Amino acid sequence: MQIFVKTLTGKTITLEVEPSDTIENVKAKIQDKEGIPPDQQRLIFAGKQLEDGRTLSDYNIQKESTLHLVLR
């Protein structure tokens, strides 16, 4: 499924992911696409900071959802 990741620079990128993917995997995908190191990535959805070892499904992230990416 497609999701959106809205960064603080004005850029929103798209990713192809599965709800069973871990947050760590998603951060690795963001690194692949945009070059941002995972340890700098703070991901937020529905007021919650996302934890590396959990999955997208754990946070009820569905198709066409938007995550917020803030850099540490």
From Swiss-Prot:
Effect of residue 65 to D: Phosphomimetic mutant that binds and activates PRKN
Location relative to the cell: Cytoplasm; Nucleus; Mitochondrion outer membrane
Residue span(s) of domain Ubiquitin-like: 1-72
Modified residues (Phosphoserine): 65
Organism whose genome encodes this protein: Homo sapiens
Source organism superkingdom: Eukaryota
Documented effect of changing residue 63 to R: Abolishes HLTF-mediated polyubiquitination of PCNA
Post-translational changes noted in the entry: Phosphorylated at Ser-65 by PINK1 during mitophagy. Phosphorylated ubiquitin specifically binds and activates parkin (PRKN), triggering mitophagy. Phosphorylation does not affect E1-mediated E2 charging of ubiquitin but affects discharging of E2 enzymes to form polyubiquitin chains. It also affects deubiquitination by deubiquitinase enzymes such as USP30.
Modified residues ((Microbial infection) ADP-ribosylthreonine): 66
Residues of the full protein shown: 1 to 72 of 229
Residue numbers marked as site, Essential for function: 68
Official protein name in the record: Ubiquitin
Membrane topology qualifier: Peripheral membrane protein
Crosslink feature (Glycyl lysine isopeptide (Lys-Gly) (interchain with G-Cter in ubiquitin)) location: 6, 11, 27, 29, 33, 48, 63
